[PDB]
Amino acid sequence: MTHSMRL
Amino acid sequence: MRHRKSGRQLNRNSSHRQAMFRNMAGSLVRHEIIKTTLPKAKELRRVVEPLITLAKTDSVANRRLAFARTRDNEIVAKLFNELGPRFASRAGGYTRILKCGFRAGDNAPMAYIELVDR
Amino acid sequence: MIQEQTMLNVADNSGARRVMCIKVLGGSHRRYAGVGDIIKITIKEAIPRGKVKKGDVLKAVVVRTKKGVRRPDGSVIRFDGNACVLLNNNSEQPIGTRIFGPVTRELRSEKFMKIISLAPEV
Amino acid sequence: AVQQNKPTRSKRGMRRSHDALTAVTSLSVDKTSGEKHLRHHITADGYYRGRKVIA
RNA sequence: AGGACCGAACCGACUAAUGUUGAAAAAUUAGCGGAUGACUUGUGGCUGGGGGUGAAAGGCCAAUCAAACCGGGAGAUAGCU
RNA sequence: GCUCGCCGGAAGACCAAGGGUUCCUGUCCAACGUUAAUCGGGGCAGGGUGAGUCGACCCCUAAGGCGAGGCCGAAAGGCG
RNA sequence: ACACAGGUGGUCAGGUAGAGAAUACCAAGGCGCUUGAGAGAACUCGGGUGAAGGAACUAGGCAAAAUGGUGCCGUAACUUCGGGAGAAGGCACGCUGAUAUGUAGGUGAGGUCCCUCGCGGAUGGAGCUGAAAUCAGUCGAAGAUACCAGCUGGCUGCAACU
RNA sequence: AAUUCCUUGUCGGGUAAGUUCCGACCUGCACGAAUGGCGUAAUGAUGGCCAGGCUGUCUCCACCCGAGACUCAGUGAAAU
RNA sequence: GCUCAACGGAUAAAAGGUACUCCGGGGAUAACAGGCUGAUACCGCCCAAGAGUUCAUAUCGACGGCGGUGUUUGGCACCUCGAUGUCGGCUCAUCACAUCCUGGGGCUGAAGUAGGUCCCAAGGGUAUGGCUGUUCGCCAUUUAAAGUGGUACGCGAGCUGGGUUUAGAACGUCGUGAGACAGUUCGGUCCCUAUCUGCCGUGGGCGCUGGAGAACUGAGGGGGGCUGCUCCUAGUACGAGAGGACCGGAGUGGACGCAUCACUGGUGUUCGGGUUGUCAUGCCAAUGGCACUGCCCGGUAGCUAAAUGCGGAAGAGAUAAGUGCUGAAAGCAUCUAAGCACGAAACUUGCCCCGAGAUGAGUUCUCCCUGACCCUUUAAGGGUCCUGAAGGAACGUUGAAGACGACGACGUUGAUAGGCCGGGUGUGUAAGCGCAGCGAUGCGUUGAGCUAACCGGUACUAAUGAACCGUGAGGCUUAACCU
């Protein structure tokens, strides 16, 4: 859900 | 922060507190000595002593106020017939607390609350 | 206690019927305006024949508050409805001639003496 | 939330140093019967300060 | 009359809050939508794995789905840790 | 037992399915019960289920299944 | 997986107020949900009230507050001529008395005729039930008094709609 | 413009002030006619914007009522 | 007979997409943050053409040169891929100074007012809104001012989740297509009960050399430190005039903080009243339960702000930039080398709070203990009996004290709490009876009845006589004295 991910 | 506030909440709301005090006042006037917890006994002092002061004058209005605060006609009968002429001399202090150990189940501080006749 | 976005009525007959406070003048971070306090207003509703039109950004002075002013006697005078008298943006002089309704004796000072010599009650 | 490493048995005993239950200092003797009781409590046989209170 | 209107049972799940080692591996509370129909529900059948079924999202097929599970090839293979 | 409170198109009363003895009586309180327990849907011993008419079984059928022969298919099997 | 705030088909369904299987309080009946006792800090949860202001909050009026019933009056653009529309916006609502020793309505006995005779048909109104309205009076700060119970309007993109 | 880069295009309206909104103009980087174009009443737990009412959203929090948190007794975890 | 040209030639023969993805690894290798560096960026200086009527150096400073900082854009790949959660907002901050305001000065192309520029200075302060996801920016309106940076572009085991950056869907464009796009658009689960350090509070133990109860000195530590406007001097000094002070003195505000409820208010589910529905007390009347405190209307005490008091200082010391006095070196000159004086919101005090665990454990006052013996490793020794003192703790009633401890008052030789009495307050004319009325209801009794937390009293009730801990004159050495 790419909010905590370092993307 | 409770600065000069009387009354104990006793982990109830207002309706439960008032109904519980009415039941305990009925049981205390009925049996003349009851076992209870300690802070409920102190609050029961502050509840049941104005009823005995109300019994010191016997009229229709005072008996209707006692019925409005006890809702038992046998209780108001015993008040206005026995506890009125018996407690007529002493001014306040119609009741007596005595501590009696602790409860076996929840380790609650026990007390006997009784009337000063016995 | 007039702060910003407060909708005040107009006490004199400058033409506006309803104004809105957009800034309480005097001092950084000032919150409120009492009677003696100038406010900056915009005009939200005007009469069709008046001296000022809708959208004018000018100054006014509060004359009545619902919160009310306190006298040194311990008293307090609370009106009903908030009101202001409209002023010239730089000259600080009132625009309309007659002033409707009561004002306070707290207002007694030079420019507002020019105001207060028009009102029916003080 | 969790510890970085477990505490010792030493730090456990130092923490539990304040958990000692206080004893009653001394029970008081009634005047008539002589039975021990707590202060300001009635006896088991229902005496308080030399007066039979409960039946 | 009406895939009509308002609104309970019933079916669903729009918003917020709480819960997030839960009371609950999908809830509760307070509002919310449909509510005579392209409705909902019971009981029983039928379709099956490169197959089914899909008012279509690669959704669902027993808390498992860009190929279910079980068992066997099988100690697959691993220049990788 | 007496008061107080709560539900009451249910938090009441009958069943189907699903459980399977949990029903009732006496006795016990190690474990179970999120505490204590003298209590229990717990342990233990006994008791309890009575039908021509209620239901199943039974007669008949739906969707569907199986299917003598038959047709088809390397075999298994498929369809009828 | 639990003595788990979940799920699970049919039958019955009383009183008062209510259009009602909603909702409020009750009946028959069944329960107080297998840890309690105190105290009455911060903080958290679920609520109640709030001076002056009234969206200044914020990504955004999110969440709350508000609105809410019946009868009557009135209601625009636009339109596929059905709608829009409950548009919008108002007014009156309690209790008592009188009309009216309860009316209009509903039911309709005893009696009296007819008969082809009974579970028949006509008059007749007892008795019961019973709105809604107007007038007059009265009480309250407030009469849809609680629970219950639409926020409304203007412009616009997309998809006709269920 | 659900399409526009440059860009918050420029002008107008709405605001005290408007990168969003509405109306226009065409310079259409890179619309366009059944992978439909342009409208459109009604509908939508649809997207954007404005207004009235309403309010603890806010200025700026205050107090109260209950359930935890705190103390006492009983039982008694977990991640690490 | 091989552009087997990827030329030591995997096959005779081979392109893509994955944001639906999966696995094994990697900080061997990128994005974020840190490190090193400093081209770039920012700040400072050097020379000086030229502008400034003349006049480089009031203010700018070309052509070029030298540094600083780490501070933008970068470079490198040192840490991290068996996880170091992003932009913005909120809450809370903290430091630097390269100072935005306030304060102190020098020069001015400084008449005054107001500026420009440079030096010193970090005590305090340093907006609200519209638009935008925005930081930024534009804009509106204020202000004394609307500083610039560091702190993982501070801050998600503190909150949010609008933006980017998962899965849905669409537009433009690219692609034959699956799909792709620092291009847009609508929608989209933010876990954690704190062990340790830290910090805010609040206790127990022991120590401080006999024990105890008090009151202090204060080493040291913290808080605080902002500023506008008006009036007077004075429309004076200055200036043709328009304008218009320095210095000094009061008043009155804004923001901020501390305190407290006398006022004005809020709250006041524990007080009084109204009222709707229903159930019950046999019924009427009167009450009670439930309906969010059923809905409301007032409101006591407490708590509290929007209410009301107070504060920021003056002074002193030592100074920064700066200005001097005397004065040589260097017959002069010179604020400086000797010597002397001034000089800021910074520093040290002055104001307020904590504070002797200040182990360097301080001082002062008061009070309390004045008994016998035995043993042994005759030691600052052990033991036995007798005495338990001042005081403390425990218990109880409690408190405008409190999470619990603690703190404070009291314990009958007594007002500590409840009750009771009287008052006050609040609400608004109780019930019953009688009259008027057909009635709802009105009137009289009646400003009645009821009243929480308030006030002044009163032993009526509960605070029991005791038991428990704590001891029995307190080491050595040296000095100074007293008998």
Ligand SMILES: CC[C@H]1OC(=O)[C@H](C)[C@@H](O[C@H]2C[C@@](C)(OC)[C@@H](O)[C@H](C)O2)[C@H](C)[C@@H](O[C@@H]2O[C@H](C)C[C@H](N(C)C)[C@H]2O)[C@](C)(O)C[C@@H](C)C(=O)[C@H](C)[C@@H](O)[C@]1(C)O
């Ligand atoms: C109910 C409680 C659940 O946690 C959450 O919902 C929170 C809120 C997730 O964030 C959710 C929601 C969200 C938005 O993060 C808040 C999203 O970005 C992540 C991917 O999932 C967490 C924390 C994720 O971690 C994050 O994963 C990232 C890949 C890296 C990140 N790390 C760098 C710091 C790390 O913390 C992640 C993977 O789910 C954790 C694993 C262990 C789990 O699956 C566990 C079982 C969780 O599901 C949970 C504890 O039950």
